[PDB]
mmCIF file of C-alpha atoms (C1' of nucleotides) in Angstrom:
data_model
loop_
_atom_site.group_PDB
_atom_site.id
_atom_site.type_symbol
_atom_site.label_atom_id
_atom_site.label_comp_id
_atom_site.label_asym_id
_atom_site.label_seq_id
_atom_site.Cartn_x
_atom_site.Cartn_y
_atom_site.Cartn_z
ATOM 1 C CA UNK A 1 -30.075 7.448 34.492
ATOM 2 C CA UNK A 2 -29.047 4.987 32.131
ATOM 3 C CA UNK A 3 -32.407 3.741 30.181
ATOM 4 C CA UNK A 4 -34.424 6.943 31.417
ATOM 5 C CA UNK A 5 -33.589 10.407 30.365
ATOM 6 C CA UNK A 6 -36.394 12.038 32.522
ATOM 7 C CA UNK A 7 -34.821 14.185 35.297
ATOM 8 C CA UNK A 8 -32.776 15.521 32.533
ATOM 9 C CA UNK A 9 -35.716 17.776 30.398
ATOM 10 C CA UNK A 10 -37.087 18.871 34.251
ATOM 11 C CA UNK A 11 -34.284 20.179 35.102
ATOM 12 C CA UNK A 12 -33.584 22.005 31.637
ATOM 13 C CA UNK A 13 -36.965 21.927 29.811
ATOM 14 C CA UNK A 14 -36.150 20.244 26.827
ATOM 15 C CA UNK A 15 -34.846 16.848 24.955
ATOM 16 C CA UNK A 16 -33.235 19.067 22.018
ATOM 17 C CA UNK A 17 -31.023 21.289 25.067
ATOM 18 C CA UNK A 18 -29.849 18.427 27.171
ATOM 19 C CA UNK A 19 -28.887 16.024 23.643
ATOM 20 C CA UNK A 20 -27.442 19.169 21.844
ATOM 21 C CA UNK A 21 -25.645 20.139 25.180
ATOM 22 C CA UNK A 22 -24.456 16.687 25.890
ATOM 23 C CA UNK A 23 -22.940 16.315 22.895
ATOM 24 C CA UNK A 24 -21.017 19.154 23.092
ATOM 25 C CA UNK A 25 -19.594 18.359 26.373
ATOM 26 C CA UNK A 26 -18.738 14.966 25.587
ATOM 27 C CA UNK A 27 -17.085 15.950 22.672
ATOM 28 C CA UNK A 28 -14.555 17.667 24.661
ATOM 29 C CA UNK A 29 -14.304 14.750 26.958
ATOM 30 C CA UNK A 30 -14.300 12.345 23.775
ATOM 31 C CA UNK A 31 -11.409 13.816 21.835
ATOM 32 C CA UNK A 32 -10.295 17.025 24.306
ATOM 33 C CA UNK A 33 -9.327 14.880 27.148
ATOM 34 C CA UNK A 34 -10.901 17.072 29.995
ATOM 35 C CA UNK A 35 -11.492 15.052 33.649
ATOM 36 C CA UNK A 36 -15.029 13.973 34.940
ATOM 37 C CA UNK A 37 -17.082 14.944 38.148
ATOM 38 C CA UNK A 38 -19.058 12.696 39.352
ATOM 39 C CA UNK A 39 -17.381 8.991 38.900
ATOM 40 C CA UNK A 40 -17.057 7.474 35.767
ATOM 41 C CA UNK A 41 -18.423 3.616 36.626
ATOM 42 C CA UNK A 42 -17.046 2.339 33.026
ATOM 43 C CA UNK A 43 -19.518 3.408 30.892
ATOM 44 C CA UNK A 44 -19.189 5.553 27.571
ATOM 45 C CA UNK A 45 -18.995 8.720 27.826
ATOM 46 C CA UNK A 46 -22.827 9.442 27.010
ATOM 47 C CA UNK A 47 -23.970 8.212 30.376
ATOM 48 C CA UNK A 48 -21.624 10.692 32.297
ATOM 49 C CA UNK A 49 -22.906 13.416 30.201
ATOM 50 C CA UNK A 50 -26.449 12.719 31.115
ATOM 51 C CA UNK A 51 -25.303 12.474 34.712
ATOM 52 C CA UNK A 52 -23.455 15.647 35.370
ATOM 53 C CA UNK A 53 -26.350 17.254 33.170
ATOM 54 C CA UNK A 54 -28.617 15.429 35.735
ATOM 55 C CA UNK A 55 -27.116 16.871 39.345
ATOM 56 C CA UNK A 56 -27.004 20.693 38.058
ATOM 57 C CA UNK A 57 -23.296 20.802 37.099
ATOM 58 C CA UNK A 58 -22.831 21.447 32.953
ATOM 59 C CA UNK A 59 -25.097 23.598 30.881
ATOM 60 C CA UNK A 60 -25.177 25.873 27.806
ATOM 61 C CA UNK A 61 -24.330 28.630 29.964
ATOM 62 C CA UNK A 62 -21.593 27.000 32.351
ATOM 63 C CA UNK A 63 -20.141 25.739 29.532
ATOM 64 C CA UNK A 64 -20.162 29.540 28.067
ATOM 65 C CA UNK A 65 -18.742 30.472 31.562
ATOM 66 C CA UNK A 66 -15.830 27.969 31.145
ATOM 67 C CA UNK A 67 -14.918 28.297 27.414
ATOM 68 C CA UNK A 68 -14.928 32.047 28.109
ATOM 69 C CA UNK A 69 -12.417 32.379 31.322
ATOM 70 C CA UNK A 70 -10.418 30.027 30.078
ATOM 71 C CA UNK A 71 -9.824 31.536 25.982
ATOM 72 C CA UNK A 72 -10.474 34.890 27.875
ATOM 73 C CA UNK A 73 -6.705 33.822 30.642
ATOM 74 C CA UNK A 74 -4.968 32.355 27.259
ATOM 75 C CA UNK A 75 -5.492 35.488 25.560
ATOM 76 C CA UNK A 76 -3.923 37.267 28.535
ATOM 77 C CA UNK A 77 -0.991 35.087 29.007
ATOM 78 C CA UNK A 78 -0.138 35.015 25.151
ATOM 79 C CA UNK A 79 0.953 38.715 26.018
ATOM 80 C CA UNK B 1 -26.633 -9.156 5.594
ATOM 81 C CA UNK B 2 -24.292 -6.696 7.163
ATOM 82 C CA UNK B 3 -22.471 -3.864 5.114
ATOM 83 C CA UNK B 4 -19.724 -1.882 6.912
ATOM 84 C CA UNK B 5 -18.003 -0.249 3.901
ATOM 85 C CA UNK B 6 -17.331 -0.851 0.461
ATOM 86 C CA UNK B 7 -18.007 -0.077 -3.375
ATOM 87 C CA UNK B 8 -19.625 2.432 -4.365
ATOM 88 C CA UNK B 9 -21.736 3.564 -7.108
ATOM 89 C CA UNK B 10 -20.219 5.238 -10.300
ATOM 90 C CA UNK B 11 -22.302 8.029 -11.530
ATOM 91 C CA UNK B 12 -23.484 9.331 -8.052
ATOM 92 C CA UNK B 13 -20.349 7.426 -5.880
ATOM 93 C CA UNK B 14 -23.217 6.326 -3.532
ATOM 94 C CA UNK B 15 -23.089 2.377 -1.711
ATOM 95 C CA UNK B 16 -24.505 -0.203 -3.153
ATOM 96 C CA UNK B 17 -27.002 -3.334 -2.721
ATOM 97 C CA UNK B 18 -27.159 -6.862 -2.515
ATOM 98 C CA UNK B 19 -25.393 -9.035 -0.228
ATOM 99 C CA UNK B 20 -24.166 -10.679 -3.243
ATOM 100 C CA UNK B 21 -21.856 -7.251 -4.010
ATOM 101 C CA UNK B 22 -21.954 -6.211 -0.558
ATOM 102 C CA UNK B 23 -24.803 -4.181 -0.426
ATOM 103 C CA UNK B 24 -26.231 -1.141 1.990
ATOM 104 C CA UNK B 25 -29.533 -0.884 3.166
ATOM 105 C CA UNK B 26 -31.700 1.504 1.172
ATOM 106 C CA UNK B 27 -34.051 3.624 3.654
ATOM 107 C CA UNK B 28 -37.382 4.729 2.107
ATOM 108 C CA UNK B 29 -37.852 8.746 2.952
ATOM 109 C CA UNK B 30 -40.847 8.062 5.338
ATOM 110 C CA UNK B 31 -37.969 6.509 7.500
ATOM 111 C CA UNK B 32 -36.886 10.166 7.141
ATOM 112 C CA UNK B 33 -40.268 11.880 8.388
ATOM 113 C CA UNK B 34 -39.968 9.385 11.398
ATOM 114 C CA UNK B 35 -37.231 11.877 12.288
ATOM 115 C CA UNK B 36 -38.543 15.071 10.973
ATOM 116 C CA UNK B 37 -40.933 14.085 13.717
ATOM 117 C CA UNK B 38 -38.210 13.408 16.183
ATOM 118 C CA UNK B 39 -36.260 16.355 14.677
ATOM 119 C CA UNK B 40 -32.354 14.521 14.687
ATOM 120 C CA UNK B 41 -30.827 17.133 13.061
ATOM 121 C CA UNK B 42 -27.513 15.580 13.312
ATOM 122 C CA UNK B 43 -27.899 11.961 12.551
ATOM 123 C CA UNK B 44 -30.334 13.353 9.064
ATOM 124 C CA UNK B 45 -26.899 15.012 8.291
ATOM 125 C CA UNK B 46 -25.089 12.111 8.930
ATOM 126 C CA UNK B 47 -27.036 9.813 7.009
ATOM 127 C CA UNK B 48 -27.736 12.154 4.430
ATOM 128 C CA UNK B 49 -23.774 12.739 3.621
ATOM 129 C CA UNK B 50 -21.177 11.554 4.851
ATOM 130 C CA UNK C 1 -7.134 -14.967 14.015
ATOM 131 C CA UNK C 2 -10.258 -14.363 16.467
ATOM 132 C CA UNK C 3 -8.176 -13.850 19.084
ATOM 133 C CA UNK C 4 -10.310 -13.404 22.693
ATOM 134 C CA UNK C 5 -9.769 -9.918 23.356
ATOM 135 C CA UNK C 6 -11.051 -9.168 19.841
ATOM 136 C CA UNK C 7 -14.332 -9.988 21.691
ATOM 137 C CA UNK C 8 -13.625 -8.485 25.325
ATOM 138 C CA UNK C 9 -12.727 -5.352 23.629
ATOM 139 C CA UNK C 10 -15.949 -5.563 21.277
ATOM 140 C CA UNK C 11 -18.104 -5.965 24.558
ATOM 141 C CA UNK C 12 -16.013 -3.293 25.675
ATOM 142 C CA UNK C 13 -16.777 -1.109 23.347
ATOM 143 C CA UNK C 14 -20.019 -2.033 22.265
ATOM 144 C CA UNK C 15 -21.355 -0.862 25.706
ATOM 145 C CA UNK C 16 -23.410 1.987 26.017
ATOM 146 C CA UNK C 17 -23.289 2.188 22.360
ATOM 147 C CA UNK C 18 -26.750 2.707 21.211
ATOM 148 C CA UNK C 19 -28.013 1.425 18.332
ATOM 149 C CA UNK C 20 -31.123 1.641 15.672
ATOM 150 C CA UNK C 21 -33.969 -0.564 14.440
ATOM 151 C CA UNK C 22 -35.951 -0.722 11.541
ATOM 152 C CA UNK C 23 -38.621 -2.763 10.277
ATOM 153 C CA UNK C 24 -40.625 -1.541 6.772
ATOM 154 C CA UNK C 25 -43.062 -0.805 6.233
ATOM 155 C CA UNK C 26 -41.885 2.326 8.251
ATOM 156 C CA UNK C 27 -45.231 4.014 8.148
ATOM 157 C CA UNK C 28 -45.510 6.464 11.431
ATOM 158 C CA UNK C 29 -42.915 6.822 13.340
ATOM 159 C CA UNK C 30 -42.994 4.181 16.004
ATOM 160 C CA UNK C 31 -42.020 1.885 12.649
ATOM 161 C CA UNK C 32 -38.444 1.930 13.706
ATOM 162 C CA UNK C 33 -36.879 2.541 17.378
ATOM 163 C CA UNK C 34 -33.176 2.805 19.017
ATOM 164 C CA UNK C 35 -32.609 0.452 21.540
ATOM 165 C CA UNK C 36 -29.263 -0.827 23.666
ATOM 166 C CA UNK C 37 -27.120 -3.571 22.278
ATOM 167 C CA UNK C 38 -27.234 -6.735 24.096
ATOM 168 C CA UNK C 39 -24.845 -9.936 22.028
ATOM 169 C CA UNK C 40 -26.119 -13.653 21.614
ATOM 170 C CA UNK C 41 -24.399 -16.703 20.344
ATOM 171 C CA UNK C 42 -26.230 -16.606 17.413
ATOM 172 C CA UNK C 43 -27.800 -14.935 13.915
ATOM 173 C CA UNK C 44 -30.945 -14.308 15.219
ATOM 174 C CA UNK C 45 -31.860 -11.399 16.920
ATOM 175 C CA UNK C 46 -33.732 -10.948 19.925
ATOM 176 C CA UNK C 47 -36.140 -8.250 21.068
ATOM 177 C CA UNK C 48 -38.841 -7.257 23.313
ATOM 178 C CA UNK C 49 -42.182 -8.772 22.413
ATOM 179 C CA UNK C 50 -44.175 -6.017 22.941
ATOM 180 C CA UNK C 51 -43.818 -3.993 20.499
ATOM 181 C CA UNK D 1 8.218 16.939 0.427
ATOM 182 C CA UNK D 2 8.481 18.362 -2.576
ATOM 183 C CA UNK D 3 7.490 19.048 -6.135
ATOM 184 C CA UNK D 4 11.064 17.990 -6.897
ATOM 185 C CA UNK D 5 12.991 15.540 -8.878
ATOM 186 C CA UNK D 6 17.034 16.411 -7.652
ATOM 187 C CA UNK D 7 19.628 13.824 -7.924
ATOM 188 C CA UNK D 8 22.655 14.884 -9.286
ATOM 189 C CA UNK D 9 25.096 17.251 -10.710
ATOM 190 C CA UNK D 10 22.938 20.206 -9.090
ATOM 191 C CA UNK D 11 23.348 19.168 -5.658
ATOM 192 C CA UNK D 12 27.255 18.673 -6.301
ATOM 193 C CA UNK D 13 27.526 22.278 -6.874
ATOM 194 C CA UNK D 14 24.959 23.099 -3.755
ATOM 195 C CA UNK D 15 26.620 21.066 -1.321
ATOM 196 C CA UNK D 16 29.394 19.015 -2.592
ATOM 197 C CA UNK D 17 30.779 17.673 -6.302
ATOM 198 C CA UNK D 18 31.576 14.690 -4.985
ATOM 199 C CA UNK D 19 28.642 12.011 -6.522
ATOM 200 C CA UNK D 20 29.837 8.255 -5.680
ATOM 201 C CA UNK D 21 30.732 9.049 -2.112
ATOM 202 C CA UNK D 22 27.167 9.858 -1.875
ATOM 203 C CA UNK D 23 26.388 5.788 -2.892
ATOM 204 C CA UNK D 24 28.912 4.429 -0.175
ATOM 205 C CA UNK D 25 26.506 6.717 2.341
ATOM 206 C CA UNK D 26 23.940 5.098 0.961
ATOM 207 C CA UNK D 27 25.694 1.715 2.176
ATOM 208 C CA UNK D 28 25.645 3.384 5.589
ATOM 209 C CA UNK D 29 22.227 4.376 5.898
ATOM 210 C CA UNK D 30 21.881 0.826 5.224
ATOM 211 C CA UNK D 31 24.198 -0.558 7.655
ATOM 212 C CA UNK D 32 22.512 1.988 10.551
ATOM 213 C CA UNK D 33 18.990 1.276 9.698
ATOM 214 C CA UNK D 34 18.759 -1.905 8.296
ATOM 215 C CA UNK D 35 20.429 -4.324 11.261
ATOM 216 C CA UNK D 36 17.532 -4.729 13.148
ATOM 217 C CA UNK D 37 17.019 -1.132 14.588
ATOM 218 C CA UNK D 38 14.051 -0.109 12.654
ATOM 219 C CA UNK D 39 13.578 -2.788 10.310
ATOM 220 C CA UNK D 40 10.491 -4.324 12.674
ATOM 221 C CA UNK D 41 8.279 -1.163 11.407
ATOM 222 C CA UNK D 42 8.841 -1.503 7.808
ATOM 223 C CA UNK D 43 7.860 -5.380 7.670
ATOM 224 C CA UNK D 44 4.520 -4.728 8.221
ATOM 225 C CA UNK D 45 4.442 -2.794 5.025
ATOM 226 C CA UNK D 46 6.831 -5.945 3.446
ATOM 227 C CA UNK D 47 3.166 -7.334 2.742
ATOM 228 C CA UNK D 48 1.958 -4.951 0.828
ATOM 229 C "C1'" DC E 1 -73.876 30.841 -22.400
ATOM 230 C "C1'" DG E 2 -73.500 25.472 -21.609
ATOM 231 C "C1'" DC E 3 -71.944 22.224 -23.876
ATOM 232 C "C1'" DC E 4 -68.387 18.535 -26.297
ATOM 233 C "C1'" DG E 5 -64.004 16.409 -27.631
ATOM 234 C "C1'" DC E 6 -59.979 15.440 -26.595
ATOM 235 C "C1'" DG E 7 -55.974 15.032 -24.154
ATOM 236 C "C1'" DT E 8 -52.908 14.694 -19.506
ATOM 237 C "C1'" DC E 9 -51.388 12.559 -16.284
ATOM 238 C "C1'" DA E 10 -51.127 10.060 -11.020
ATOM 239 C "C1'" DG E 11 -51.535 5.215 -9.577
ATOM 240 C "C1'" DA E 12 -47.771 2.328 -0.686
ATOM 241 C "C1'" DC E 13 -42.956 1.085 1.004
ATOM 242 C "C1'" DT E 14 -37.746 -1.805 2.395
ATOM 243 C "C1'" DC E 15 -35.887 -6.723 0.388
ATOM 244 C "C1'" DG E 16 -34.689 -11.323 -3.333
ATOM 245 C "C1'" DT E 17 -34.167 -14.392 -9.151
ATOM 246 C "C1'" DA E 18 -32.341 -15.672 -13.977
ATOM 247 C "C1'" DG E 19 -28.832 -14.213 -17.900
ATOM 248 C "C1'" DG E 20 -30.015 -12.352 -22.524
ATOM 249 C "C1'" DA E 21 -29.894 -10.519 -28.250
ATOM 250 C "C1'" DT E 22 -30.377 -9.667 -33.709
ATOM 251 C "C1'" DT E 23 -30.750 -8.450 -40.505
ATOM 252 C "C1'" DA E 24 -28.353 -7.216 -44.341
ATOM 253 C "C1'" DT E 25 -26.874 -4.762 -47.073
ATOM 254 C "C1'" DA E 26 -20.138 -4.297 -54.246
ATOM 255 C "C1'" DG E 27 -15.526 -3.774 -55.703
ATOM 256 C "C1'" DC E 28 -10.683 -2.150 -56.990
ATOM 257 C "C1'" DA E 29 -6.831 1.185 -56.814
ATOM 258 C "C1'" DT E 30 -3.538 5.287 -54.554
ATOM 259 C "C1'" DA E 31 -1.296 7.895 -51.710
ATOM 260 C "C1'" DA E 32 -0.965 9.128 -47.427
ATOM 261 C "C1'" DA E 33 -0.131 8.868 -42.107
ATOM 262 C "C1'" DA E 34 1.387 6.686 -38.394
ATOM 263 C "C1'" DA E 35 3.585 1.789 -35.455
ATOM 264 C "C1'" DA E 36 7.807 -1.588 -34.900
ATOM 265 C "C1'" DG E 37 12.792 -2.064 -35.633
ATOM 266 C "C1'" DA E 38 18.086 -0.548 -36.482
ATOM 267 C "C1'" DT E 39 21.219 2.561 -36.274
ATOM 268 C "C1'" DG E 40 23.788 5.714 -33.798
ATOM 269 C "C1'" DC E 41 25.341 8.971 -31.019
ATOM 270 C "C1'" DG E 42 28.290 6.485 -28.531
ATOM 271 C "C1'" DA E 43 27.059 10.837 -24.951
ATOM 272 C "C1'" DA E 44 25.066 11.554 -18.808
ATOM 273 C "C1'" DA E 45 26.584 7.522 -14.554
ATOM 274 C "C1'" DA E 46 28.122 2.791 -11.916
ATOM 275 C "C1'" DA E 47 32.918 -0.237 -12.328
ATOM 276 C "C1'" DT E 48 38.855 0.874 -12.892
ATOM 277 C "C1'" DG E 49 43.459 3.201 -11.832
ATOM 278 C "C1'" DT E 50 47.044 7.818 -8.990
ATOM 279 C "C1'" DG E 51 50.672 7.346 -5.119
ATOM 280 C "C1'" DA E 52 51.458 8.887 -0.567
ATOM 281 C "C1'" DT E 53 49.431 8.392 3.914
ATOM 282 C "C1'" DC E 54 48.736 5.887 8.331
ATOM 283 C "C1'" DT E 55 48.651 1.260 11.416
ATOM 284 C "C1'" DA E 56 48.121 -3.293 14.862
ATOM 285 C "C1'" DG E 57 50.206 -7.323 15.712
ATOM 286 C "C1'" DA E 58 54.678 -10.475 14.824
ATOM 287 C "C1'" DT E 59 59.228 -11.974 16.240
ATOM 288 C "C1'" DC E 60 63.649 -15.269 19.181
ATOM 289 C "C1'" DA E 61 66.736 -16.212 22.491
ATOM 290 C "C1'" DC E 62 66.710 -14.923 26.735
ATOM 291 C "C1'" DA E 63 65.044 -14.774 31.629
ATOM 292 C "C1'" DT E 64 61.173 -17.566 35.396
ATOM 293 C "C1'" DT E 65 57.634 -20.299 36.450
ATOM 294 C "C1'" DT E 66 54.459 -23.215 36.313
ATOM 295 C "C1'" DT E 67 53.439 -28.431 35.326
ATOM 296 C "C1'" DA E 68 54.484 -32.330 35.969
ATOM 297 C "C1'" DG E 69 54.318 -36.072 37.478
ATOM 298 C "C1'" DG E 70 57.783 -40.199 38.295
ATOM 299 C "C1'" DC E 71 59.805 -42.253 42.057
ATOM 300 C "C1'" DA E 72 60.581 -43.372 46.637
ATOM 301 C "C1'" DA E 73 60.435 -42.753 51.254
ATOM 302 C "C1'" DA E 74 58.163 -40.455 55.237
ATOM 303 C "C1'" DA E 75 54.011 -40.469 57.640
ATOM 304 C "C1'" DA E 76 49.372 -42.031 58.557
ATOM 305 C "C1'" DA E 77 46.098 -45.723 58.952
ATOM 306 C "C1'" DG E 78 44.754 -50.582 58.932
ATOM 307 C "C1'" DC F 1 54.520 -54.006 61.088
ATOM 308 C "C1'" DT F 2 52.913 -53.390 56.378
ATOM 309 C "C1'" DT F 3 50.609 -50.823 53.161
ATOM 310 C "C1'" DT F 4 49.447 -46.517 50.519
ATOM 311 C "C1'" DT F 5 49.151 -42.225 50.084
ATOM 312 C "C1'" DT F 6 51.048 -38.051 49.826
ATOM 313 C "C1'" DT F 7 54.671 -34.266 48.882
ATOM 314 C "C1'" DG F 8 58.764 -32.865 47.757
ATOM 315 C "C1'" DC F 9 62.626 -33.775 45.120
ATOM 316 C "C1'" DC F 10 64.648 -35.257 41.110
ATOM 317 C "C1'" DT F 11 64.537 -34.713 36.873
ATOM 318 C "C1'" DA F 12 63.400 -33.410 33.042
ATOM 319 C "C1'" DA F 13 60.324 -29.530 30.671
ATOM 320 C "C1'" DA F 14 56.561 -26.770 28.747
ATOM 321 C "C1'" DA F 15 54.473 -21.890 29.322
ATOM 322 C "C1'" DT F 16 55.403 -16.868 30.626
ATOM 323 C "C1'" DG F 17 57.327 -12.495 29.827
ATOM 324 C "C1'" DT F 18 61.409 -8.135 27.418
ATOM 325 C "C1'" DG F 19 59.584 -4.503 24.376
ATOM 326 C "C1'" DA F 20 62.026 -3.028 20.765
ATOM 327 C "C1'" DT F 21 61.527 -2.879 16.207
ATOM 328 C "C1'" DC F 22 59.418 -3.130 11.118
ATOM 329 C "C1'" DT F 23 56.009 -4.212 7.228
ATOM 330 C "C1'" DA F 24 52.305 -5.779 4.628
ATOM 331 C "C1'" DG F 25 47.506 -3.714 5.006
ATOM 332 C "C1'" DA F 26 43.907 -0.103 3.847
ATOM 333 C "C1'" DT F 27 42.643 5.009 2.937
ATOM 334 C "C1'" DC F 28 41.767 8.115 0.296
ATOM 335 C "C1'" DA F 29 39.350 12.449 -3.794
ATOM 336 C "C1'" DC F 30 39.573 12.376 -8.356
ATOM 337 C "C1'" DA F 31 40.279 11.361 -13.812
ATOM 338 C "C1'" DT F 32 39.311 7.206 -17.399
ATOM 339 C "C1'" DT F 33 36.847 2.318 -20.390
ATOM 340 C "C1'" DT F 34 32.025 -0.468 -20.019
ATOM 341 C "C1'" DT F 35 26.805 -1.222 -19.358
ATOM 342 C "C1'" DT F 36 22.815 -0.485 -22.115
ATOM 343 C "C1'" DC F 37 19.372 3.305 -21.514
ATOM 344 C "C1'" DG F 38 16.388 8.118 -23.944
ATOM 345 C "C1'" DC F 39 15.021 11.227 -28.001
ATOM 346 C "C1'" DA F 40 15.864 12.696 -33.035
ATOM 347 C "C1'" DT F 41 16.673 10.042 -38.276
ATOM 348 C "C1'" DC F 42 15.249 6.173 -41.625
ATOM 349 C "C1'" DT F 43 12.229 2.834 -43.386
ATOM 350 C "C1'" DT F 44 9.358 -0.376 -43.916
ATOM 351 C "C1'" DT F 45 4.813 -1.582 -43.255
ATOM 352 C "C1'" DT F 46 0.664 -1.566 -42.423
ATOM 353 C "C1'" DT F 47 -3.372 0.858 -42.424
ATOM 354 C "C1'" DT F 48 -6.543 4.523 -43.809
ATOM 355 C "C1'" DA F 49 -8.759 8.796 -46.359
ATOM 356 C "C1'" DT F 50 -10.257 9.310 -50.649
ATOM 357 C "C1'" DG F 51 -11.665 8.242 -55.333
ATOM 358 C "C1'" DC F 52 -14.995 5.208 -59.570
ATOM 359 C "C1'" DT F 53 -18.544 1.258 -61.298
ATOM 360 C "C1'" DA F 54 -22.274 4.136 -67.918
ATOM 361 C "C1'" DT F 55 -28.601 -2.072 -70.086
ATOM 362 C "C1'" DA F 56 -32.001 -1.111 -66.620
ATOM 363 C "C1'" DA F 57 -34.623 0.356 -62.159
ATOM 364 C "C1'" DT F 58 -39.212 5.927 -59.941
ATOM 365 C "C1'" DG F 59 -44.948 7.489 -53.197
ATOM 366 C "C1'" DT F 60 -44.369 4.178 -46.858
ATOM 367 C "C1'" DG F 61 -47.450 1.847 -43.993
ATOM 368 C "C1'" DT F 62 -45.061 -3.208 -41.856
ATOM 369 C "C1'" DG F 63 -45.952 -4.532 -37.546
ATOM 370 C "C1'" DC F 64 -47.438 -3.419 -33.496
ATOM 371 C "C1'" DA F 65 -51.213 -0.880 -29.356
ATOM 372 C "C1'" DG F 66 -54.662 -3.226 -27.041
ATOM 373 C "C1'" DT F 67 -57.461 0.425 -26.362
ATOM 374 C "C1'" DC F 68 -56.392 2.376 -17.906
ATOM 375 C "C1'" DT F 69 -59.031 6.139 -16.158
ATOM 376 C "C1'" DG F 70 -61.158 9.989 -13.527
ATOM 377 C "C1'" DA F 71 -60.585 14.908 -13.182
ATOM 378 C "C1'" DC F 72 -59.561 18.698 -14.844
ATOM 379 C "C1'" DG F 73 -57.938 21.878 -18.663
ATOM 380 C "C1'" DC F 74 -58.744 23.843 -22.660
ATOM 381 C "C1'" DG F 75 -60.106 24.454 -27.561
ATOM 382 C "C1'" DG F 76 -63.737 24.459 -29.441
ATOM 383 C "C1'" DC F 77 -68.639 24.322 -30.315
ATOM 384 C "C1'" DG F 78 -72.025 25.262 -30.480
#
DNA sequence: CGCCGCGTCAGACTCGTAGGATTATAGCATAAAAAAGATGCGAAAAATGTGATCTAGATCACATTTTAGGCAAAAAAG
DNA sequence: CTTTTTTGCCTAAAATGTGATCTAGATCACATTTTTCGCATCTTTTTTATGCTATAATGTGTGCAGTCTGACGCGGCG
């Protein structure tokens, strides 16, 4: 995974998606402080971005899925 | 020559060059269209800014 | 002071870091690539040849 | 944290007249900072 | 209509190298505005001075009590 | 049997313990003389805005460009 990013655009279909995406997720891993998946194999955190993006774990929409239960529960037990 | 951070210019606050006063690397714009055919949205920003 | 972990921390960090290249004239776009650091006891870098 | 310049006369009538008391505090604050319980952090910025 | 004169305005990219300027041009006098002191005003605030409140060790002739070992003789070893 | 080594005694003797009873120390919140400071005067002191000088004097160029050039505009230019 490390010098190719192939099975990464045929699972999604694109290179913008799966850099945009990856950023994202790794910036909440980067700064956020949120646990991995698959192991971690001391590397930065751009090669376990292009991993978990690689086995059919993170996308745009799980992402959405996640950020939304999540701020959806806080909302909920602010009340 | 390596240039990290440093002076800047005065009218337009923008590094400098020569190794001599420390200078940063100029990139001509067709280094730009290189992207614009890559399409690096983020690192134009980057470069362009900050 | 160069101390020693000033240098196993920069190989610690410097992993995985990617990094650009640039040679002018930059005229298309294969002028200038990204490729993974790799250090050397010296001020000469190193590259592949083919390219 | 302030705006402010206060050191004097108007405090003595918000909290207490008393002015030169206030210097032999300052001795304290000495005394409890200075003997090496927090010292180590400021001589870093002794340099500067 | 089909010229003619004339003018306008573009001329591939990222680095390095040196410091560097010159001519001549009137004179005096006045009254005004702004710059360095002294003075001074000895003022605000650090020292000094109020007297009554408190306190932990300090004492001497006793009574033990250890030290204190000097001798000699009792006991142990040569 | 003689030596020495030990302890206990003699014999002289320092160290321990009574606590009761003061006494010089240090506190302790608040008024006074000194520092020499800061802005207003003077007060010079220098410096600066302004004002005249009565033989006579009457049209530049001033140092350069080395002239890019091909296409297209546009005013003419007929």
């Amino acid at each position: 995974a490390r010098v190719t990013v192939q099975d990464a655009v045929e699972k999604i279909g694109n290179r913008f998606d799966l850099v945009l995406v990856a950023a994202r997720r790794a910036r909440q891993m980067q700064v956020g402080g949120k646990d991995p998946l698959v192991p971690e194999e001391n590397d930065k955190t751009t090669v376990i971005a292009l991993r978990e993006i690689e086995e059919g774990l993170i996308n745009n929409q799980i992402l959405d899925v996640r950020e939304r239960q999540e701020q959806q529960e806080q909302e909920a037990a602010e009340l | 020559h390596a240039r990290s951070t440093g002076s800047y210019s005065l009218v337009t606050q923008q590094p400098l060059g020569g190794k001599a006063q420390f200078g940063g690397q100029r990139f001509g714009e067709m280094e730009v269209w290189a992207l614009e055919a890559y399409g690096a949205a983020y690192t134009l920003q980057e470069m362009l800014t900050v | 002071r160069e101390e020693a972990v000033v240098w196993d921390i920069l190989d610690e960090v410097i992993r995985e870091h990617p990094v650009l290249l640039n040679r002018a004239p930059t005229l298309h776009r294969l002028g200038i690539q990204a490729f993974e650091p790799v250090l050397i006891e010296g001020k000469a870098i190193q590259l592949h040849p083919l390219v | 944290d302030m705006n402010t310049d206060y050191t004097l006369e108007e405090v003595g009538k918000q909290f207490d007249v008393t002015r030169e008391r206030i210097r032999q505090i300052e001795a304290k604050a000495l005394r409890k900072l200075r003997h090496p319980s927090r010292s180590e952090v400021l001589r870093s910025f002794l340099d500067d």
